[PDB]
Scaffold this active site. Structure first.
Site, PDB file in Angstrom:
ATOM      1  N   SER A 134       0.762  -1.154   0.277  1.00 51.82           N
ATOM      2  CA  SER A 134       0.130   0.318  -0.244  1.00 51.82           C
ATOM      3  C   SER A 134       0.855   1.260  -0.111  1.00 51.82           C
ATOM      4  O   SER A 134       1.234   0.918   0.761  1.00 51.82           O
ATOM      5  CB  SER A 134      -0.843   0.292   1.244  1.00 51.82           C
TER       6      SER A 134
ATOM      7  N   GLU B 297      -4.396   6.766  -1.163  1.00 52.54           N
ATOM      8  CA  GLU B 297      -4.389   5.255  -1.641  1.00 52.54           C
ATOM      9  C   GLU B 297      -4.202   4.576  -3.123  1.00 52.54           C
ATOM     10  O   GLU B 297      -4.736   4.692  -4.240  1.00 52.54           O
ATOM     11  CB  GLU B 297      -5.070   4.702  -0.858  1.00 52.54           C
TER      12      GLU B 297
END
Ligand SMILES: Nc1nc2c(ncn2[C@@H]2O[C@H](COP(=O)(O)OP(=O)(O)O)[C@@H](O)[C@H]2O)c(=O)[nH]1
Ligand SMILES: [Mg+2]
EC number: 2.4.2.-
Lengths: 173, 208
Positions: free
Chosen positions: B131, B171
């Site tokens: 991530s 993100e």
């Protein structure tokens, strides 16, 4: 001479307005709390180093007519628009609360939080994160999924709503 | 080559929305992802725990991993981009857990040198999904290690912000089991943060 952040809980019946209030207040998951029962709560919490006092109006709503509703919408400083991720109807309804709240307060930028409760019931989800998160972006507010059961994000929504209220109080004075 | 590093949050968001809208992810892949964002720690932890083997995963999790892996067939970066993320001392190894830092909060000179000796100029395989974010957000800053990933055009990388539990902001997700080369390792002016620059090589998981 201490800051008092008046929060109002809104959302359809059975979404978890009471459970959330109680979970935050006494750290317990109170189930099936009297549906028509309303109550305000006021506890002291330390918000970012500073100590303040929060006031939470856990509305019943079944019989809060124009005059009653308008008064506390007008008095409330921050709003937690709660719905249940497993009930599409409650989500659709959030637009009504938003609308009425912006009508009486004659403002398009009042402290507000879109809360999708019952994130622990993933198997019964009816409202997608994408959809809810998209609506929040349209209203220019944050979307948070909580679980009055597991306590996930419960503190977050209440403290984040305060932070929005505390900031709005800075713009003014 | 040249690498696009975002500096304006609106530009970054607009860009991300531009790619996401093109993915055409099924409902299951979106759900698989939302689920990843709700428990990245557990999933990635389990992937590291087994060095990447998944044949021991319950059907629910193993089903999700497959969706996750294959969703990347729809998510590729159209250009060279820079992705950022933060890490703790355990990232460099268990033997750094309580050694990396000084009492005043700065990275320890000797610990750092041992870190370079151990990683600088070497490929590194990450068992879990990576991530990251399109920008050097606040989700970091207070973390001992910062990594700038150079992801080349065409690489597997997807903007998943529209469906994540605001784990920071902007993100960005990279495939699991990816290898990357750590080109540089230096300290910040602060002296309390290690800046790692790396080149993303890719994953070994290429289903479909
Ligand atoms: N599984 C689950 N049930 C919840 C949660 N929050 C509330 N409930 C249940 O949903 C019902 C409605 O909750 P309540 O707090 O009374 O909602 P209100 O009408 O908005 O005040 C009750 O049966 C609760 O026990 C939650 O986070 N998870
Ligand atoms: Mg109630």
């Amino acid at each position: 001479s201490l800051a008092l952040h008046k929060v109002i809980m809104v959302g359809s019946g059975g979404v978890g307005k009471s459970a959330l209030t109680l979970q935050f207040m006494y750290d317990e998951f109170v189930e099936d709390y009297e549906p028509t029962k309303a109550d305000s709560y006021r506890k002291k919490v330390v918000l970012d180093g500073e100590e303040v006092q929060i006031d939470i109006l856990d509305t019943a709503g079944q019989e809060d007519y124009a005059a009653i509703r308008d008064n506390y919408f007008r008095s409330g400083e921050g709003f937690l628009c709660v719905f249940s991720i497993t009930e599409m109807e409650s989500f659709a309804a959030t637009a009504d609360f938003r609308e009425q709240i912006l009508r009486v307060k004659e403002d398009e930028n009042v402290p507000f939080l879109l809360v999708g409760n019952k994130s622990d019931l993933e198997d019964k989800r009816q409202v997608s994160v994408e959809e809810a998160k998209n609506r929040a972006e349209q209203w220019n507010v944050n979307y948070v999924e909580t679980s009055a059961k597991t306590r996930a994000n419960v503190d977050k929504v209440f403290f984040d709503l305060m932070r929005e209220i505390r900031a709005r109080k800075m713009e003014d004075s | 080559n040249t690498y696009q590093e975002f500096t304006n949050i609106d530009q970054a968001k607009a860009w991300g929305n531009a790619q996401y809208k093109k993915y055409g992810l099924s409902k299951s892949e979106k759900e698989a992802i939302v689920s990843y964002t709700k428990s990245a720690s557990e999933i990635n932890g389990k992937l590291r725990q087994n060095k990447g083997v998944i044949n021991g995963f319950p059907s629910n999790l193993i089903k999700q991993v497959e969706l996750l892996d294959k969703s990347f067939n729809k998510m590729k970066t159209p250009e060279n981009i820079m992705l950022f993320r933060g890490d703790d001392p355990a990232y460099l190894g268990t033997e750094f857990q309580n050694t990396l830092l000084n009492s005043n909060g700065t990275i320890n000179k000797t610990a750092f040198e041992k870190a370079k000796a151990k990683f600088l100029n070497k490929d590194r395989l990450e068992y879990g999904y990576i991530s990251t974010s399109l920008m050097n957000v606040s989700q970091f800053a207070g973390r001992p290690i910062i990594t700038k990933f150079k992801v080349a055009k065409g690489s597997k990388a997807g903007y998943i912000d529209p469906i994540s539990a605001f784990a920071g902001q902007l993100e960005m997700l990279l495939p699991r089991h990816s290898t990357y080369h750590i080109d540089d390792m230096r300290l910040s002016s602060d002296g309390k943060q290690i800046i790692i620059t790396a080149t993303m090589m890719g994953t070994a998981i290429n289903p479909k």
